[PDB]
Amino acid sequence: GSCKGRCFELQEAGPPDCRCDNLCKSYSSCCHDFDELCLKTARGWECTKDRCGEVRNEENACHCSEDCLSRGDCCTNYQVVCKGESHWVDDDCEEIKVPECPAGFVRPPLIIFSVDGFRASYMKKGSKVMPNIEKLRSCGTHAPYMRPVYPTKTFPNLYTLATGLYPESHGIVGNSMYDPVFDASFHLRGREKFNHRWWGGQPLWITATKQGVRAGTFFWSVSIPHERRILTILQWLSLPDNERPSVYAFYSEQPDFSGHKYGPFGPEMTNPLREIDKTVGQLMDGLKQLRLHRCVNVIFVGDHGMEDVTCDRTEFLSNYLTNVDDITLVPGTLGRIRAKSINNSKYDPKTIIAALTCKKPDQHFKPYMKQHLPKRLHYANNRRIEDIHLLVDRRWHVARKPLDVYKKPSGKCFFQGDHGFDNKVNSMQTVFVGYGPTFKYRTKVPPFENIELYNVMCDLLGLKPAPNNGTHGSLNHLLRTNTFRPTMPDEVSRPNYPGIMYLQSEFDLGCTCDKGSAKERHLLYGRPAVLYRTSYDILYHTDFESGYSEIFLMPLWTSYTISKQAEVSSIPEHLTNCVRPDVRVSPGFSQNCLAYKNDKQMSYGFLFPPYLSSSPEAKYDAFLVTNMVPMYPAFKRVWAYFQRVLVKKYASERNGVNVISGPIFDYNYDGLRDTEDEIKQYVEGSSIPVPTHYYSIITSCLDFTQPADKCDGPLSVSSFILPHRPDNDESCASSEDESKWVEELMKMHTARVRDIEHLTGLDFYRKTSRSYSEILTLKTYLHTY
Ligand SMILES: *[C@@H]1O[C@H](CO)[C@@H](O[C@@H]2O[C@H](CO)[C@@H](O[C@@H]3O[C@H](CO)[C@@H](O)[C@H](O)[C@H]3NC(C)=O)[C@H](O)[C@H]2NC(C)=O)[C@H](O)[C@H]1NC(C)=O
Ligand SMILES: CC(C)CCC[C@@H](C)[C@H]1CC[C@H]2[C@@H]3[C@H](O)C=C4C[C@@H](O)CC[C@]4(C)[C@H]3CC[C@]12C
Ligand SMILES: [Ca+2]
Ligand code: NA
Ligand code: NA
Ligand SMILES: [Zn+2]
Ligand SMILES: [Zn+2]
Ligand SMILES: [Zn+2]
Ligand SMILES: [Zn+2]
Ligand SMILES: [Zn+2]
Ligand SMILES: [Zn+2]
Ligand SMILES: [Zn+2]
Ligand SMILES: [Zn+2]
Ligand SMILES: [Zn+2]
């Protein structure tokens, strides 16, 4: 029928006549009078001194009559031009200790101001370009940058912000994606994205609605001007108590559109950055007009950054594969390949991997089986994530064939910037600013991941978060109140402490070789808790302590401390192939050397390095069968270099380091610790499981003037999850000296301590002088280099 009076309605029971909401233009339909009653534009969007005190001319976009403040439909500059007040940006920011909200407000509202493609570096253009945004940053809580999820695209990141899930869990693994169960494709442009079958998890607007918290319509048809969106949000905030939503969302497609066109370093970028700042100012002027500028929590958040890319820098699969017409490629700043699924696609995953592996000297992309991607990306577990993946170098593109490159008729590309690269790339980092009563005042917080924001916004709204992948409590330092109180998880499996129980006479099944007060110097942060049911033993030695699993026949963790001045010894010739039985552990619960001799592809290594033994007598402990783990010979090149060369180097740089190393089983690549039933590989003819990865947590003192074992204040951690591979094809320069490639491989596979905890069932840093919230921040820190 008619949209009279009910423009941008939030009807839940049932709109009477037609459709009049924000998303009626794009999807479904609208009434006929929508564009006049609801999309008024007369006089523009700012008040003139000529029209101050006007008579309510309803046809106007916004009103400058004195009755506008009652209905909340004034122009955002009405108080400034018609009542002599100042702009919000011209006021000195005053510390907001408590929310200054109207009488009926039950919780301080949350407005999410999302900007598409706002590079974190844009914040340095200063107040001459973005005075409003600079006031939000300098007076609220801001990080230097926020880390998006991989892929660093719009839809995966905006939905990750709304759900707190990795894209592999909430389902929006890309702007483009194919679902084999649906047998359909999903795209930014289309009506398919409106179908609810694509969206997993529980987004914030659903979490709020299910718990009684009203949410305004987060989305807007593209034909709704930004000034009308701001005016609509301010009109909703003037609704009565029983109808007023508590959470709102404003999304701007800029500066993404200009960043794509002119690049991130173009002088033209100051024009859209000014228009965004004016939209922010219109919102803050409108909130000050409603006296809500010291009541509402405002989150100025971006989805991803922006990198200089050009048509010039494009890699083509036709330069690597013989036939590219039998595969489908999701191209651009990333690569996802799948079979055309025709009758005879004739397609082999690792054959295509092999054809893409280290073929050109300056190759600007690397192929991966999705299971072998760096575990920090968490982009391996979804039916919509193809098995083959390409990590594209920053500043570069990957395409199927050269004809796919679209350029202007002139000798110039259509785009100068793009986005979607690895989320540790500095140009992909985006902006986070929190401004309001619940956020801290003039506070700078360390960079963090956007998966953590859903928990925070649930805390800001009094909502119990749906199960997600943020670490609840790791961002408490952002808020001045309403924090979540994290609890250290209960230990599930309690260790045995075995003494000398066996005679060594019923031992050495194929092997040959020619307590608690001195090991505390190696277990600085308490023993890790085993959060799953298992049987395991604590083993003490002069140089290291270990939690040996009687089930997996190997330690779950091995802890030891190396000092700045520790000297590296070699492995003696008479001890190179020495393995000694451990009289504390039953022979039936120990590994045996017969299995390694029979397994022609599996060697063995040691979790504690014999290279760092404190004395010749102590070195015999490092060769115990309980310190031994299965290791491919190709992996031993990485492990031996790390143990012999890098541990000493790190200890000399960081004034000593404490190292915790152990195995990882993830055969179903869900990022979670495997049970026995899921382990799919053992050492030949034995029950010794093979780890898919090996982790190490290298902790030292943040204050490098104090040694690692005498550290007072905060800790400095760098962890990694190295893939246990029978080859080093991931490292193109592995033929050269290990000093050229081993550390580059380890930096690529950096990881959160939290990532290691998901994959092991262990819980670290349980005995520290720091608060648990501070430790949760430590566990969620990524050394990106
Ligand atoms: C990111 O968060 C996700 C939760 O939002 C985690 O995914 C969850 O993993 C759980 C592992 O047990 C699944 O539990 C299953 O729940 C169903 C309920 O009907 C039951 O089968 C079982 O309780 C359980 N299944 C098994 C085999 O134990 C959750 O279903 C699952 N959640 C979703 C939404 O899929 C991710 O693991 C987590 N990612 C990381 C890296 O930690
Ligand atoms: C590009 C513009 C036209 C805007 C497009 C908006 C579009 C992506 C939005 C509009 C409606 C959204 C769905 C709706 O809010 C409800 C749900 C249920 C919830 O449990 C999961 C998310 C889902 C399906 C929303 C997905 C995003 C939609 C389609
Ligand atoms: Ca698993
Ligand atoms: Na062998
Ligand atoms: Na190689
Ligand atoms: Zn119009
Ligand atoms: Zn300038
Ligand atoms: Zn975007
Ligand atoms: Zn973009
Ligand atoms: Zn094979
Ligand atoms: Zn892929
Ligand atoms: Zn015998
Ligand atoms: Zn495991
Ligand atoms: Zn990794």
Author numbering: 56 to 569, 588 to 858
Per the authors:
In this work, autotaxin from rat (r-ATX), which is a phospho­diesterase producing the lipid-signalling molecule lysophosphatidic acid (LPA), has been used as a challenging case study. ATX is the main producer of LPA, forming the ATX–LPA signalling axis with LPA acting as a multifunctional lipid mediator by engagement with six dedicated G-protein-coupled receptors (LPA1–6). ATX regulates many pathophysiological processes [e.g. vascular development, neuropathy pain, fibrosis, rheumatoid arthritis, sclerosis and cancer].
We applied our iSX approach on a challenging project, autotaxin, a therapeutic target expressed in a stable human cell line, to determine the structure in the lowest-symmetry P1 space group at 3.0 Å resolution. However, application of iSX on micro-crystals facilitated the determination of the first RT structure of r-ATX at 3.0 Å in the P1 space group, with an effective data collection of <1.5 h. Subsequently, 29 550 indexed diffraction frames were merged using the partialator program within CrystFEL. We determined the in situ r-ATX structure at 3 Å in the P1 space group using molecular replacement, followed by refinement in Phenix. The iSX dataset is limited to a lower resolution compared with the cryo-SSX one mainly due to a low deposited dose at RT.
